[PDB]
Design a protein around this ligand. Structure first.
Ligand SMILES: Cc1c(C(=O)c2c[nH]n(C)c2=O)ccc2nnn(Cc3ccc(F)cc3)c(=O)c12
Ligand SMILES: Cc1c(C(=O)c2c[nH]n(C)c2=O)ccc2nnn(Cc3ccc(F)cc3)c(=O)c12
Ligand SMILES: [Co+2]
Ligand SMILES: [Co+2]
Lengths: 381, 381
C-alpha cells in the first residue's frame, strides 16, 4: 500500500555531504576506494575563505566532503558578505559535529520542486528548522531541517553545475575512475527510539511506510511517492545475548546519526572486484564473507534467478543475496569508513520490478540476518 | 665547523606523528600516495579506548597518524588506568590542535640513549616541558618538550616493535607498497621570528648551526653531533613584492608549526614516477614544474654529475637540482598535503659525501630559489 502522501513534490536523492576535519584526504581516499571522479570544488582557489568543499561523482551519485578553514580567514565577513558557497555552513557547528561524531554524514540532500515551499510546509508540519531557504545566484534554493541527531535533510531546487560558486574541476586533476556505482539507493539512520523518530519524519514529509517482506534492531522504511527516496531508520533491541550493533553505533557516535549509505551498482560483480583490489592499497575493507554453506543454500532460494556460475561469482566476492515477492537483491557491506565503528557503505544491485525499475525492488535484505545465522551454524557442524 | 655540542646522546629521527580528525582516512591516503606499508596499530581492536593510532613505514621512515575517540569511551579511566598507548595523548589537546591548525605534525620524534635524561637536561636548559618521561612496559621511555608552536620534540629511548601496546598489522591487511622512500632527512618549521626560535631550540639541545652554501624567508639549520638530525627553521621576510609563503603559512596555520618533511629516496626517479602515476587517483600532487630553461641550464651546473639522459629524466619528472661544495642534491616538492596551504612534503636524494653518506650532503637547495627565478624569466624571453 502506497498512499502517495508526500506533502511537497520530491524528485531524487541529490547528494550526501560529509563533514570532515580535512576534506582533501577523505575525498582522495573515497575517490580511489569507490571509483568516483573529482568533479567540482569550492575552496580557497575559488574565493571561498570559509570552507573547503570537494565533490565526487559516479553516475548520479554525488558525495560532497567539507571541512572548515581557520575562522580568521573570514573574520571580516558577515552573512550578507560571505564567501561560503554553502550558506548553511557554520564553523562552530562543523567543528562540534566532527569532534562529537568523527567523520560522518551531515546532510542527506534531496532535490525538490521548490525548496522554499518544501521548507515551509515541513516546518508547518513539525520539522525543526536548521537553515532557512536561501537563493544562490538567483538559480538554486537550499534549505535544511533536522532529520535525526545532527543530521539534516537538505532540500535543493533548481530554476533551470553542482551549486553556484563551485567550479568544475580541471580534467588533468580529474581522472575518470568508474567501478560501476550509479546512484544512492537508500540512506539509513540509527536512533535510540524508532517510534518518535518515524512519527517526526513521516509527520513533516508525508513519506509513507514502505512495506517489508533477535538480530539487534527494529526498523522501518520511509519512502517518497514514487519510492525512490528511501530512508530506513533503526532502533536497537536490548537484552539480547549478542550486543546490538545499533547500540554500539549510538555509543561510539555519541547518539543518533546516519548508519549506512547504500549505493546502487549497474554491475555489482565489477564494482566488488574493483573495490576489493584496492582494499589494502587505500580503499575500503569488506565485512567477513559468509561461509560456503550460505552459497550452497543459494541454489534453493535464487536458483531461478542466478545461474550456478553467477552464484559462484557471488561466493568469490562475498556478495549476499535476498529476495522479495517482487524482486531479488544482491548486497555487500564495507567495514566502517573511518576510525569509529559507526558509518559504513552498502553496495547493492536489484533484479526485477521492471515497469524503469521500481524503487526498493527486492527489499533491503532483512532475511539475510536469519540466513547468515543459519549458514554460520550449518558450516560449524 | 661542527662543535659537537649536543647536551645528550641523539641517534636518529624515529617517527613523525600527525594529529588527525580521522586517522584511518589520512593513513590510507598517505599509504597509497607515498608507498608506505601499514605496519602497526593501536586502536579499539587492541584495547585502546582513547585514541586510534596507525603506523606507516617505508624503510626507516615512520609516519604515525592519530585521532581521538569519543571521550565517553574512556570516561572511567584515570592516567594510572589509561588504555592509551601514547600516555602524552590528550583529547582536548588533540581536538584543539586539529581545529586550530588542521591536519599537521604534532610530534617530531628522535631516538635518544636515555629519554628521561634527555628530558631533564633539556628542561634544565630552557626547554618548555610538554609531557614528562613515562616508562612503557618497562621497555621504552617517552618524553616531550615544546619545539615551536604546538609542535613537540619527542624523545624515545629503548632498553633493548614500535611502542608497547601497538600490534603488528596482519599481513592480509598489510600490502607491501614501496616506491623507494627510505628515511626522514629533515623536518622544517615556520616561525614568526627566527632568532628567538633558534636560541630556544639550540639552547636546550646543544644542536649546532649547520653551515649553508628576496625569496620570502630567512632560515637556519640546527643539527645534532653527526648531523643526521636536521631541523631547519624559517621566518618570513616582509615588504617584498611577492607575499612570503612563510607568512601565508603562519596565517593559514594559525601560527608557528611544521612546514615540510623531506623524505630521502634511494631512487628518486622511481619514487617520482610512482608518486606521479597516483597523483590523480588518491595520491599527492606536485608543484608546477620548472621551465625547460632550468633543465637547459643544468648542463653547466651538474653536467659532471648527471648524464644528459639523467638530466632528461629529471626534466620529465620535474625534479630540481642543487649543489654544494661537497655534494649534489636532487629534490622536488608536493602541493600541500591537506586543505590548507601549510604542510607539504619534499622528496630528496643526495649524491656525494661518502666516508656511509654524511648528513646534509649537498645542502638544502637554497640556490634553487635564485635558479628558479632566472630560469622562469629566461623562458619568458
Ligand atoms: C546492514 C545490513 C542490511 C541493510 O542494509 C538493511 C536492513 N534493513 N534495512 C532497511 C537495510 O537498508 C540487510 C541485511 C544484513 N545482514 N547481515 N549484516 C551483518 C552484520 C554486520 C555487523 C553487525 F554488528 C551485525 C550484523 C548486516 O549488516 C546487514
Ligand atoms: C621548500 C624549498 C627548499 C627546501 O626544502 C629548503 C630550503 N631551505 N631549507 C633549510 C630547506 O629544507 C629548497 C629550494 C626551493 N626552491 N623553490 N621552491 C618553490 C616555491 C613553492 C611555493 C612558494 F609559496 C614559494 C617558492 C621551494 O619551495 C623550495
Ligand atoms: Co541497506
Ligand atoms: Co627541504
Amino acid at each position: 500500500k502506497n498512499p502517495k502522501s508526500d506533502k511537497f513534490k520530491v524528485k531524487r536523492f541529490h547528494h550526501i555531504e560529509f563533514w570532515c576535519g580535512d576534506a582533501t584526504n577523505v575525498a582522495r581516499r573515497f575517490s580511489w576506494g569507490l571509483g568516483m571522479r573529482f568533479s567540482a570544488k569550492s575552496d580557497l582557489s575559488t574565493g571561498n575563505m570559509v570552507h573547503a568543499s570537494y565533490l565526487l561523482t559516479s553516475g548520479d551519485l554525488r558525495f560532497l566532503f567539507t571541512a572548515p578553514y581557520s575562522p580568521s580567514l573570514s573574520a571580516g565577513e558577515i552573512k550578507p558578505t560571505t564567501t561560503a558557497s554553502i550558506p548553511s555552513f557554520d564553523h562552530g557547528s562543523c567543528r562540534s559535529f566532527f569532534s562529537s561524531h568523527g567523520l560522518g554524514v551531515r546532510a542527506v540532500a534531496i532535490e525538490v520542486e521548490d525548496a522554499e515551499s518544501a521548507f515551509s510546509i515541513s516546518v508547518a508540519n513539525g520539522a525543526i528548522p536548521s537553515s532557512p531557504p536561501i537563493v544562490l545566484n538567483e538559480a538554486v534554493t537550499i534549505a535544511e531541517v533536522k532529520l535525526y541527531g545532527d543530521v539534516v535533510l537538505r532540500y535543493v531546487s533548481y530554476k533551470a553545475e553542482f551549486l553556484p560558486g563551485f567550479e568544475r574541476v580541471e580534467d588533468a586533476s580529474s581522472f575518470p575512475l568508474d567501478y560501476g556505482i550509479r546512484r544512492l539507493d537508500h540512506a539509513v539512520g540509527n536512533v535510540p527510539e524508532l517510534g518518535p523518530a518515524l512519527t517526526y519524519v513521516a509527520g513533516f514529509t508525508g513519506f509513507h511506510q514502505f512495506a517489508e517482506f533477535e538480530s539487534g534492531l527494529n526498523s522501518a522504511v520511509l519512502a517518497s511517492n514514487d519510492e525512490m527516496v528511501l530512508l530506513p531508520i533503526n532502533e536497537p533491541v536490548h537484552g539480547t545475548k549478542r550486543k546490538s550493533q545499533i547500540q554500539t553505533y549510538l555509543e561510539h557516535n555519541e547518539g543518533a546519526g546516519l548508519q549506512h549509505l547504500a549505493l546502487m551498482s549497474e554491475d555489482i560483480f565489477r564494482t566488488l572486484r574493483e573495490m576489493r583490489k584496492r582494499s589494502s592499497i587505500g580503499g575500503f575493507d569488506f565485512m567477513p564473507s559468509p561461509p560456503p554453506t550460505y552459497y550452497q543454500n543459494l541454489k534453493k532460494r535464487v536458483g531461478d534467478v542466478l545461474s550456478d556460475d553467477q552464484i559462484k561469482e557471488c561466493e568469490e566476492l562475498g556478495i549476499l543475496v535476498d529476495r522479495d515477492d517482487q524482486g531479488t537483491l544482491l548486497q555487500i557491506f564495507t567495514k566502517p569508513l573511518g576510525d569509529r565503528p559507526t558509518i559504513f557503505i552498502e553496495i547493492i544491485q536489484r533484479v526485477g520490478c521492471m515497469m524503469y525499475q521500481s524503487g526498493g525492488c527486492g527489499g533491503f535484505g532483512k532475511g539475510n540476518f536469519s540466513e547468515l545465522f543459519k549458514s554460520i551454524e550449518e558450516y560449524e557442524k
